[PDB]
Design a protein around this ligand. Structure first.
Ligand SMILES: Cc1cn([C@H]2C[C@H](O)[C@@H](CS)O2)c(=O)[nH]c1=O
Ligand SMILES: Cc1cn([C@H]2C[C@H](O)[C@@H](CS)O2)c(=O)[nH]c1=O
Ligand SMILES: Cc1cn([C@H]2C[C@H](O)[C@@H](CS)O2)c(=O)[nH]c1=O
Ligand SMILES: Cc1cn([C@H]2C[C@H](O)[C@@H](CS)O2)c(=O)[nH]c1=O
Ligand SMILES: Cc1cn([C@H]2C[C@H](O)[C@@H](CS)O2)c(=O)[nH]c1=O
Lengths: 348, 348, 348, 348, 348
């Protein structure tokens, strides 16, 4: 017996939709949901989605509040819809998927993922919910996450981190590292060998290896010397060149974090969505060096060093394909005289 | 257990709110309420009110569907709020009153008119609803309508017509003529002797007396001759003078209806609400004669003739006060040499 | 190379989208599309849909401008989407279907109806477009209209009328009567024997048989006498009973048209969409007789007489199912002593 | 001392802006202006313009309420702005011009038309306002209307009709026929000899000559015979050909009015603004004959007969230029063997 | 061949409009532009301007991405429009100028600044764009910036800083100090001697002289002693007096920055736009001392000391005019017994 007033009751009393009975008076004005408290209107939700306001409010109240895979992982695995949950995309302030299954009458394409409409879609299944491992076993197309083994299914160890209420973290009190499984047309896939992005912020960047600690503490020349990185253009690619009007390199988040400690810069996120590679229009405040499309990836510095050191450096320009977050990332590799000139996630 | 989805269920299945259980999926976009039918959105309500869309939808669904007093009558009697009903104003496409009692959680100031918040307000009571005559006797301020006698209460016979779902009519299958009662400060008030406006339209105007039939069929000079109206300026007041740039007189609806048969005209209703006297910005299409503020009243021609023939014509200018629809309407009477020059509902 | 400015160029120069090259400056403000003419903004389109304004403008410009089946027929046949066209619903001022195929990048689920996403959906195909009969033979689910024979496919003769730019008409200069074909799960389905609604308006109702001419010209008792309709409750069902507060019967459009000639009435279309049976909240202006849910069907009076005269009248109450517009319409038949008491399209 | 509350006071009390002192409480919600009456909100203005609601409300209240040239005439004369008035376009529900002079602080480019910003613009001047003839003599660019002679200025007799509060009429109580004067680059320009469109509606079309009365009363063949119009393709051009899917000819409003008497048709005004030639997407209801772009002009039938009879008919196709409403209207003349095939206001 | 879909393609792929061919599907909902990515809507732009959303999106995509003069400088120089660029005002989130030249079809008044409409306007010209120095030489009214000498034109050295993508900076990798030139009615002006505001932020304030370093490091009494500022009321004007309910002085940004290090305060920017002098409604959090209109200017402390030390201190109150950012700034100077009481940028 779903209703706007019941969703609002749940938000006010339970912090989110919790299946509780009850109703609170609500008013809708433009794209905002309000409720009366002490005789005055209090805002419960402002719609930032392209869905109708009451519909978006319901999907947001029904968002998954357990650690879930980051949207970039789900997107890279081709997930179309989730089974009986809403994966809320905190970067877009919107549902990660267009439709739902057993969530909301306005967006539901089905009540159960066993309905024929779901068979062609890659349905996200959560092994932490009773019966969902079995539903995945019977599903034509799907992606499954579990905390442990599934009998007979060979797992893919996912990233250490997961998103919990829009906070990306490596769980200590909760498990965030999932086993991943994928079926395409009834066939359990062998998920590829993959690197994972680290999903760190610039403001609270923390190193996750001795190499990363050395990159942040050491000066450019002594780090490159210590790790034998001469000829790999880390001065351009990772540290960044701020000497010309066009900002040189700066494609690894760790390099942006090191620069951020010294001086600030503007990062215009012109396509604001979670993705393995992010594109920013960057303006360095200290120098005025800028770049319209600066592709940035947050790889563990050791993983980036392994990738660059594993390439043939004898060609002027070529595409280097690296599986990151289960997707194929194209990088452009530019070399001269057996040394790297630049290496960056391809802007295509 | 009120809800948007339950109000929508009632509208879809019962044509209005009928206390039925059930829910339909709804989407709100901007100021319109939609429901899904055959996979597509169908409009159930467009909010033309200053209330939030969902609140206005509920009051509209809960509108009174019995013949009720026309809003102009309620306004003239000082009605502030209705007891456990919504008087919908079909001319404003909005509730006739700001607040409610026992109707909707967002607009309710009380659940019952016996609550102390209602005591200072003139509450509308309907004797056709069980217990409402008793609530009127206990109310400090109120207006009561009944179909018959109330023991000990002196009645006022109201207009023949009432509004049924926005159609003003003299009931044949239903009763539309009510007894009216009013209380101010716990004391029943004597309602004055009053004329009533006829509530006719220009497009479908029908005469309601032999004098009115003669006005529409006869030529100006022979009507005035037949009814001995020489010296009462009906040529200006009722027929209208279209010979100058400023349209002369034309203050009785019957005169506008007679003119409308010959040639059309524009009537700008610049304050669009039901009132005993209406003000229009009129432009005559045939002549180009116009008037920014042309006060128009729809009185039965016999009643208007009785009013004008009952005035002293020996003063240049004076205010003539006539009780119409329970309100005192001020008219400006201009005379010269014992004859009327003009007589019009006095502009403010 | 689709664009808002190109769609606007087509609307301004061709009256609709006509595949022409060119661009006009456009401004979007709120839900309206404007273009500059003589230095000022001129409205090209007001969005009444739940789609984004620019998306709705494109689908509207790309609406089918040939005579097409009325939306009620498509809905009754289970049509979900149209192949490479937009069926515009002129009663809802919106696209008849949520998604498109080869029409607009924002609403397209596919470019061609042969894509696997279309297989589960009932795709509308138009034999007047080259290759669409072949696409229907290859489609798993679909509805096809043609002007002539399709080799081996058994046809269903559709209604005489079709909608041309929102005008329902029986074509004289164009063909409006189509052959209909339908497929479910890759199998051609036999369309049932059906009556067709006449799609007439109350304001411009025209009789289409000698019986219908006699119903409108003759008095109630002599019509019933002439057509031997004694005992079939036409007095209640067709003519309508306006003697009580609840309006009795009045379920055939021809009866509403006969009443409309004598006196007016309000018809609240509370679910405004094209359907075989319409539900209205009716208020008779002459009497004040009203009904919240008055189901009305526009059948040719001869067809309604054939239906009612073909029923067993020996049971108190039973459901009578009649195929009308390809859908099964349930009617409630109430009898007493071998005579009809009431017969109406059964309310849900 | 202009203000929103003062404009609203003027609208409520004077029917429009009348320079009166006073204020009324107003509320703005979305694009509508409301005022409180009897404790509830009453709509004073709904903004249909691309200006801010409060700005549009002020220009609308300050609209010219005297008979003014129809917007199509002003547009054809190149008018950009009006001197100290607002020409309201009643077909667009918006100001005819983007900017103002001495009207409203938000839209004013100047307080007086003598300011240098006005010199390049064609300013509309009204000889009925004191000092405006002098302002026209001092203006570099302008259009002047007067009721009589201006010493030394050669006049152009304008159309008989003018627009008074959105009603196009030939004044009887007011003057609607003006003398027109125009200046370009400080030099008075000779206005060309011109025909004038009649500005009639389809619903209330009235003939204005014996030829027009004969066209509406007589049958096609006897009218063409009486007026010796054999060989001028009036059967196609004026009467219209409804025998094929594409509606033939039908370019004179009088022909559409004659057809309208027999059967109705849909006229989609896809660029809704006043213009000498109008383009409609027409659908004939009787036949289903339709045309995406049907150019229609309302010329007096005698004027159209004079135009067509004054052309050389010995060429297959040529452009015929006719001055109508001061603008040069291009017509496409198609002939064969010394007879007209078609003649229509040439589509762009 | 400009279009919404092409502007969106450029934003998505190039970070801004870069003249690239291509189209992306877009949806417009209310004042926001979205594009489809991975089946879901991603926000590209939210309109904060008074222009139509699609128009503002285009001007924002076409903003100048080179270091440009800060809007306060352009405003102070009387710039009305820019030649073939958009100066985006990052403080108003809107275009700095109402109209454009060769930028966007909806806002363009001309395609080239040589068109007669541009001659009266002060057109901004950029010597870094080929041909713009020459266009300025031929322009009646304009402001020109260059990086070096223009033959024959005497330059005005502008501020050290410029705005690069909304970041005000003193360029190291790019040039931000321009030569300024101005023509008024075809005559090259002698730009006045001027101070420049420093355009610093409170959060990241950095001293730009030894005096400024001493002001931030030293205690009030020893700074005033070191720089011989006794009698100039720096205790009130620069340091600020927080001992009474009305906050005393505090008109130099450096003083606000020194206070900000110790304790925070609210600065309400009630007219949010770039200006030489800013007015704030300030509330000191530590003391509760507040001021509705606290004028603040960011001058180099040495420049402010030079200004105050160059005034006659023998009058109670007078206006002191100082050219700052090319505009005349009025300051109120209050003295008593040959000493300053207060000196502040005049609130007029
Ligand atoms: C309260 C509120 C939340 N949201 C979204 C933003 C975050 O993605 C997330 C936070 S729980 O939900 C809105 O969009 N509007 C709101 O008002
Ligand atoms: C359907 C509908 C109705 N109304 C109001 C208008 C009339 O006053 C009355 C008619 S039942 O209710 C709206 O305001 N919007 C609507 O959509
Ligand atoms: C001009 C226009 C049309 N439409 C819809 C209404 C009709 O169903 C149909 C008529 S062509 O198109 C709108 O919705 N808004 C418009 O402005
Ligand atoms: C009352 C009102 C008027 N207008 C415009 C429409 C007509 O062109 C004209 C009629 S006076 O003024 C609006 O736009 N909104 C309104 O509410
Ligand atoms: C993405 C975006 C930008 N803008 C404006 C803000 C800044 O002035 C500037 C930042 S590049 O552009 C908006 O107004 N809305 C937006 O969504």
């Amino acid at each position: 017996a779903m209703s706007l007033e019941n969703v609002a009751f749940n938000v006010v009393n339970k912090g989110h939709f919790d299946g509780q009975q009850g109703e609170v008076p609500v008013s809708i004005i433009n794209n905002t949901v309000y409720t009366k408290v002490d005789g005055v209107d209090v805002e419960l939700f402002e719609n930032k989605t392209t869905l109708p306001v009451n519909v978006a409010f319901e999907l947001w109240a029904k968002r998954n509040i357990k650690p879930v895979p980051e949207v970039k992982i789900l997107n890279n695995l081709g997930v179309d819809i989730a089974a009986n949950t809403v994966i809320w995309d905190y970067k877009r302030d919107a549902p990660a998927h267009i439709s739902t299954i057993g969530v909301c009458s306005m967006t539901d394409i089905a009540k159960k993922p066993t309905e024929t409409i779901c068979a062609p879609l890659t349905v996200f299944f959560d092994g932490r919910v009773d019966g969902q491992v079995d539903l995945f076993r019977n599903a034509r197309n799907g992606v499954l996450i579990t905390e442990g083994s599934v009998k007979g299914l060979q797992p893919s160890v996912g990233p250490k981190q997961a998103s919990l209420n829009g906070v990306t973290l490596i769980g200590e009190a909760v498990k965030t590292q999932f086993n991943y499984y994928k079926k395409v047309d009834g066939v359990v896939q062998q998920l590829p060998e993959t690197y994972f992005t680290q999903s760190r912020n610039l403001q609270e960047f923390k190193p996750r290896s001795q190499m990363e600690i050395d990159f942040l503490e050491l000066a450019m020349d002594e780090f490159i010397e210590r790790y034998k990185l001469e000829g790999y253009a880390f001065e351009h690619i990772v540290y960044g060149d701020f000497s010309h009007s066009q900002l040189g390199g700066l494609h690894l988040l760790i390099g942006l974090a090191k620069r951020f400690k010294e001086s600030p810069f503007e990062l215009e996120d012109f396509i604001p969505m979670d993705s393995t590679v992010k594109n920013y229009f960057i303006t360095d405040a200290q120098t005025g060096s800028s770049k319209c499309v600066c592709s940035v990836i947050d790889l563990l510095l050791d993983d980036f060093v392994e990738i660059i050191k594993s390439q043939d450096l004898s060609v002027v320009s070529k595409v280097v394909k690296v599986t990151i977050d289960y997707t194929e990332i194209s990088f452009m590799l530019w070399c001269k005289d057996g040394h790297v000139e630049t290496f960056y996630p391809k802007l295509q």
